[PDB]
């Protein structure tokens, strides 16, 4: 078998690992962002409860 081909199969794992790591960081970042929306939405709701139609 070609030496390059042999390297490529091993290589495929490296790319996948880097991709997952890259994606992995972003997911956490997105999760943090979701919390930030919750606080803003929650604050308005809390205000509405104190004084609002419903």
From Swiss-Prot:
It comes from the Viruses. Residues 5-50 are annotated as: Heptad repeat 1. Subunit of the fusion protein that is processed upon entry into the host cell. Mediates fusion of the virion and cellular membranes by functioning as a class I viral fusion protein. Contains a viral fusion peptide that is unmasked after S2 cleavage. This cleavage can occur at the cell membrane by host TMPRSS2 or during endocytosis by host CSTL. In either case, this triggers an extensive and irreversible conformational change that leads to fusion of the viral envelope with the cellular cytoplasmic membrane, releasing viral genomic RNA into the host cell cytoplasm. This is Spike protein S2'. The chain holds residues 919 to 965 of 1273 of the full protein.
